[PDB]
């Protein structure tokens, strides 16, 4: 889902995948509904789209 219909990294990707798992900042008690994603999409996304 995250690869095909959200944001694709290329097959010959040269770069670092720097990411931290934060629970203090981006979590609201009741739900941060601002952050959003897609489940259904009729096209597999090419990289950097």
């Amino acid at each position: 889902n995250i690869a095909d219909y959200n944001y694709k990294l290329p097959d010959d990707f040269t770069g670092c995948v720097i990411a931290w798992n934060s629970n203090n900042l981006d979590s609201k008690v009741g739900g941060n509904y601002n952050y959003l994603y897609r489940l259904f999409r009729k096209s597999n996304l090419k990289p950097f789209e």
Partner: antibody, heavy 118, light 107 residues
Framework: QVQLVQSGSELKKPGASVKVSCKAS????????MNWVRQAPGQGLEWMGW????????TYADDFRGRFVFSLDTSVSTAYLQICSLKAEDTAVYYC????????????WGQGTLVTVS | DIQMTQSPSSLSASVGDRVTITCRAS??????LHWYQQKPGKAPKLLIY???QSISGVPSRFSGSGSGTDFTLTISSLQPEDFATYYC?????????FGQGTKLEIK
């Protein structure tokens, strides 16, 4: 009406540990954050850290990472700060602030705990 | 880390005039800045949030505008009972930085 009462003017030794109060009323206490700022009389406001209102984790600012401890007591809407091992340079007031996780503006209303140390 | 400055430091004003105070940021805070007012011996209160919009429940003698690194508000009708130290507050990057202050004084 939303207002945040505070404790009286503390006056203790350089080396004791006291606990100021910030009691909340009127709004949803579990919605927003509970930031704290301090103000020296020869200086201005400095952001010093916030706490989440359901877990109570005390994340601090990058400058004062040490002796300061926030303690949350839920379902009473009290937001106590616990300063420990006071020094001679800590003769500053401490203001209470409601600053949420999404909007992050302070709006400091707080009467001012006159922490005089000698 | 934002060196947040404001000019002029101490300016005077009279009754019912149109004053303009500006406040400048080193880095881009493009649409997130808040304006505060602080009387001596009194806790502050929000005036203008996000540099354009205003809170309900404030006297609307003033309005705010600005983007980029240049931010201001214009008090279109000043009254002598203000005499207060005005503060800016951005909302873009940690740590959160205030301004030094523009204290208004009567002649």
């Amino acid at each position: 009406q939303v207002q945040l009462v505070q404790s009286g003017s503390e006056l203790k030794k350089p080396g004791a540990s006291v606990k100021v109060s910030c009691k909340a009323s009127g709004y949803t206490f579990t919605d927003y954050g509970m930031n704290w700022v301090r103000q020296a009389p020869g200086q201005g406001l400095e952001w010093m850290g916030w706490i989440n209102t359901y877990s109570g984790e005390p994340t601090y600012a990058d400058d004062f990472r040490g002796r300061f401890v926030f303690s949350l007591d839920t379902s009473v809407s009290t937001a106590y700060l616990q300063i420990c091992s006071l020094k001679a340079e800590d003769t500053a007031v401490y203001y209470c602030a409601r600053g949420g996780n999404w909007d992050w503006y302070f709006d400091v209303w707080g009467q001012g705990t006159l922490v005089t140390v000698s | 880390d934002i060196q947040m400055t404001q000019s002029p430091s101490s300016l005077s004003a009279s009754v019912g005039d149109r004053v303009t105070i500006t406040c400048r940021a080193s880095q881009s805070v493009s649409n997130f800045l808040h304006w505060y007012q602080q009387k001596p011996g009194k806790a502050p209160k929000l005036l203008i949030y996000y540099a354009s919009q205003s809170i309900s429940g404030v006297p609307s003698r003033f309005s705010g505008s600005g983007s980029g690194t240049d931010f201001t508000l214009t008090i279109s009708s000043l009254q002598p009972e203000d005499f207060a130290t005005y503060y800016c507050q951005q909302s873009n990057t940690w740590p959160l930085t205030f301004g030094q202050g523009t204290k208004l004084e009567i002649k």
